[PDB]
Design an enzyme around this catalytic site. Structure first.
Site, mmCIF file in Angstrom:
data_model
loop_
_atom_site.group_PDB
_atom_site.id
_atom_site.type_symbol
_atom_site.label_atom_id
_atom_site.label_comp_id
_atom_site.label_asym_id
_atom_site.label_seq_id
_atom_site.Cartn_x
_atom_site.Cartn_y
_atom_site.Cartn_z
ATOM 1 N N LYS A 343 0.810 -1.211 0.000
ATOM 2 C CA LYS A 343 0.000 0.000 0.000
ATOM 3 C C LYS A 343 0.847 1.266 0.000
ATOM 4 O O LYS A 343 0.445 2.279 -0.580
ATOM 5 C CB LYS A 343 -0.934 0.001 1.214
ATOM 6 C CG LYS A 343 -1.968 -1.109 1.191
ATOM 7 C CD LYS A 343 -2.855 -1.085 2.429
ATOM 8 C CE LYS A 343 -2.107 -1.486 3.694
ATOM 9 N NZ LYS A 343 -1.354 -2.758 3.532
ATOM 10 N N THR A 344 2.015 1.231 0.647
ATOM 11 C CA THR A 344 2.869 2.415 0.703
ATOM 12 C C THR A 344 3.454 2.748 -0.665
ATOM 13 O O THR A 344 3.494 3.920 -1.060
ATOM 14 C CB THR A 344 3.985 2.201 1.724
ATOM 15 O OG1 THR A 344 3.460 2.341 3.049
ATOM 16 C CG2 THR A 344 5.109 3.204 1.517
ATOM 17 N N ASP A 397 1.733 7.958 6.391
ATOM 18 C CA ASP A 397 2.256 6.651 6.001
ATOM 19 C C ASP A 397 1.420 5.514 6.574
ATOM 20 O O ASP A 397 0.972 4.628 5.837
ATOM 21 C CB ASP A 397 3.711 6.519 6.447
ATOM 22 C CG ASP A 397 4.457 5.451 5.674
ATOM 23 O OD1 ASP A 397 3.792 4.577 5.079
ATOM 24 O OD2 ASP A 397 5.704 5.481 5.661
ATOM 25 N N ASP A 398 1.212 5.509 7.887
ATOM 26 C CA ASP A 398 0.512 4.422 8.565
ATOM 27 C C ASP A 398 -0.297 5.007 9.713
ATOM 28 O O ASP A 398 0.273 5.446 10.718
ATOM 29 C CB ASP A 398 1.494 3.365 9.069
ATOM 30 C CG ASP A 398 0.859 1.998 9.199
ATOM 31 O OD1 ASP A 398 -0.387 1.918 9.177
ATOM 32 O OD2 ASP A 398 1.603 1.004 9.321
ATOM 33 N N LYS A 425 -10.163 18.567 8.235
ATOM 34 C CA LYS A 425 -11.296 19.362 7.764
ATOM 35 C C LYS A 425 -11.027 20.853 7.929
ATOM 36 O O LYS A 425 -11.917 21.631 8.276
ATOM 37 C CB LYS A 425 -12.572 18.988 8.509
ATOM 38 C CG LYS A 425 -12.827 17.500 8.608
ATOM 39 C CD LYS A 425 -14.267 17.214 9.005
ATOM 40 C CE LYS A 425 -14.562 17.684 10.422
ATOM 41 N NZ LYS A 425 -13.794 16.915 11.437
ATOM 42 N N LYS A 502 4.873 -8.657 -1.167
ATOM 43 C CA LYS A 502 6.093 -8.566 -0.369
ATOM 44 C C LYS A 502 6.457 -9.923 0.224
ATOM 45 O O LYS A 502 7.627 -10.336 0.204
ATOM 46 C CB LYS A 502 5.904 -7.517 0.727
ATOM 47 C CG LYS A 502 7.114 -7.259 1.607
ATOM 48 C CD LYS A 502 6.870 -6.032 2.481
ATOM 49 C CE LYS A 502 7.628 -6.097 3.798
ATOM 50 N NZ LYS A 502 7.162 -5.063 4.770
#
Ligand code: ATP
Ligand code: ADP
Ligand code: MG
Lengths: 534, 98
Positions: A343-344, A397-398, A425, A502
């Site tokens: 995902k990164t 990132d996470d 927001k 991975k």
């Protein structure tokens, strides 16, 4: 008179700032250019200070010295902010007192005929009973800013001073220091655009042109369109680095090769040195950092099937929406999927393919051991920096590790969650855009904490789900010599394969540690053992 | 046209930090700043507390480049012991068993 009505600010100093001068002089100092007789007849008092804020190293002090000189004033008395502070009791205020002495004496002996004294400050926010509001214990006395105010405007009046102050953070300035009769005119010094990056470059390289040291190869329009969001100090450093690298190149080359004296005296720098230094030496602060991408996209991006294209196209559409639309200047998105699904890397690629001026990545790898308040401060600083460019792209990132989530309990930090929820927001100042990309592996928890209601969209990063996709990925990755691959294809026809990319890399590398005989069986056994299904 | 003068200083951290510190630091900075224009100044200094020194002393044009010396090195330790024991062997007093 003190200056001609149209003033002049060019070629002697200040570069890209020309509108700023006219604005400031028309707004505030109009009482020192009119004929003195009418000024006296009207009976008006002159302003007693101004304030300048903006990025760091963007050309503020130069403007202060120029404005001080052009008024026919005595030499400025500079002083730095954090330096006037002592642990002794009642000694941080004597330092403040010891700056108005000469003006006091000159007004004492000569009344209403003295000159002007400019007391330029720096980092004026260090002395303020307002930094304590932010989490922590730093009260800075709150007596310091009561000894400066009582000297500017107290029972005794001074009429021959002009205080100019500069600061980087305009949101920590005490409120009692901006009322009429005190520092009462604000002004902003932003980053330089194209014309400024041309004028500054022209100014800083006139000497080398005078003696023809510069070669005819180098232009300046080309270098004024590549430098995006550079600040002036960065341009000066770039010129210096180009000079140094060209000097080193010439000495080394002429030493190695016994060239004739003709080229030995000649020290032409050419353009290759410029590009080399620009691409290898200087790293901007408010611009793209092309180095860290290589630490995330480590093995390129492989196209094992369909989903990759869909994800990339959706990212492109969101980027296009944020670029060229009004009534909606803030856009968010969230990428989620099973662990080890990559995902990164996709987020980094989506960010890189935008060609935005300002790109930043905020990951937890650089917050090891930090207390939570430190995390909040770092996030706020990154967003504040992102607010100072026309277009921007910030990646988180996470999101599950930023909160310190642990299934037992459950437990986590509330402060970071609330800060993030508020920051997702908040629109930027008028006329500026932004784009935020998230990432996580536990969608349900974020859904439960009422966080998925703040994001505006969602994208799914699927996993390898069939044997054919695995075979194509292996083929493109180029391993197993295409003959054991036939046996692998025979064995993996079951189609019940649920593995991450991975983990696949790890398994291939691990299986490649034996002799050609047992490699295939070892790899097949490892895949079968880890063959858990949804 | 003149040679280079090398002025060595030690323990700068002590002076950089009760109002004497600021005036002393400014007095030192005055010459290197450029008012006194000295173009022959090699100032190799030493210190043990990088956190108790003004960063202005390292502002571009002040100190610029820095370096630190680490452990004696295993091979470097061997080399220094060799040098000392060779000075000893200069008269062969040291026994061969060593
Ligand atoms: N199509 C692809 N998509 C994603 N990553 C890919 C792809 N092809 C190869 N890779 C490689 O896969 C690795 C991506 O793993 P990554 O660090 O993104 O995992 P992750 O799921 O984010 O990890 P974690 O959940 O543990 O944080 C990188 O080495 C990247 O080069
Ligand atoms: N508009 C400009 N034109 C030319 N040089 C500039 C400009 N702005 C900044 N500089 C360079 O930046 C340096 C001064 O930085 P300064 O503005 O004092 O930083 P700060 O705002 O932190 O005090 C000078 O060396 C000057 O050459
Ligand atoms: Mg991840």
């Amino acid at each position: 008179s003190i200056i001609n009505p149209d003033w002049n600010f060019e070629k002697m100093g200040i570069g890209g700032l020309d509108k700023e001068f006219s604005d400031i002089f028309r707004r505030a100092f109009a009482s020192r250019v009119f004929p003195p007789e009418i000024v006296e007849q009207m009976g008006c008092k002159h302003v007693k200070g101004i304030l300048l804020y903006g990025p760091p190293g963007c050309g503020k002090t130069l403007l202060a010295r120029q404005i001080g000189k052009m008024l026919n004033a005595r030499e400025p008395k500079v002083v730095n902010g954090p330096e006037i502070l002592n642990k002794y009791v009642g000694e941080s205020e004597a330092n403040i007192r010891k700056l108005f002495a000469d003006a006091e004496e000159e007004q004492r002996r000569l009344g209403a005929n003295s000159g002007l004294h400019i007391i330029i400050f720096d980092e004026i926010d260090a002395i303020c009973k307002q930094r304590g509001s932010m989490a922590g214990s730093t009260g800075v006395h709150d007596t310091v800013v009561n000894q400066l105010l009582s000297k500017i405007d107290g029972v005794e009046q001074l009429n021959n001073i002009l205080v100019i102050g500069m600061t980087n953070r305009p949101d920590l300035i005490d409120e009692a220091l901006l009322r009429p009769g005190r520092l009462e005119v604000k002004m902003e010094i932003g980053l330089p655009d194209e014309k400024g990056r041309l004028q500054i470059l022209h100014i800083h390289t006139a000497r080398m042109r005078g003696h023809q040291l510069l070669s005819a190869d180098v232009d300046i329009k080309e270098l004024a369109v590549e430098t995006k969001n550079f600040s002036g100090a960065e341009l000066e450093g770039l010129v210096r680095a180009a000079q140094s690298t060209a000097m080193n190149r010439h000495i080394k080359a002429s030493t190695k090769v016994e060239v004739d004296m003709e080229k030995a005296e000649s020290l032409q720098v050419t353009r290759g040195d410029f590009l080399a230094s620009l691409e290898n030496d200087i790293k901007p602060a408010f611009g793209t950092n092309q180095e860290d991408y290589a630490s995330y996209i480590m093995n390129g991006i492989i196209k094992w099937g369909d989903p990759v294209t869909r994800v990339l196209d959706d990212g492109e559409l969101l980027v296009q929406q944020t670029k060229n639309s009004d009534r909606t200047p803030l856009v968010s998105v969230l990428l989620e999927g099973p662990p080890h699904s990559g995902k990164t890397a996709l987020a980094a690629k989506i960010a890189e393919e935008s060609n935005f001026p300002f790109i930043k990545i905020c990951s937890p790898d650089k917050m090891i051991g930090f207390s939570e308040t430190a995390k909040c401060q770092a996030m706020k600083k990154i967003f504040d920096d992102a607010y100072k460019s026309q277009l921007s792209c910030v990646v988180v990132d996470d999101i599950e590790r930023l909160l310190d989530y642990v299934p037992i309990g459950p437990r986590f930090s509330n402060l970071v969650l609330q800060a993030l929820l508020v920051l997702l927001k908040k629109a930027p100042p008028q006329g500026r855009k932004l784009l935020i990309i998230g990432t996580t592996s536990r969608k349900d928890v974020l859904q439960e904490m009422e966080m998925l209601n703040a994001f505006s969209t969602t994208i799914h990063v699927p996993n390898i789900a069939t044997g054919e996709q695995l075979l194509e990925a292996l083929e493109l990755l180029g391993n197993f010599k295409d003959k054991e691959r036939t046996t692998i294809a025979q064995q993996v026809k079951g189609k019940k394969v649920w593995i991450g990319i991975k983990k696949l890399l790890m398994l291939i590398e691990m299986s490649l540690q034996m002799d050609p005989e047992y490699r295939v069986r070892k790899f097949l056994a490892l895949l079968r053992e880890e063959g858990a299904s949804p």
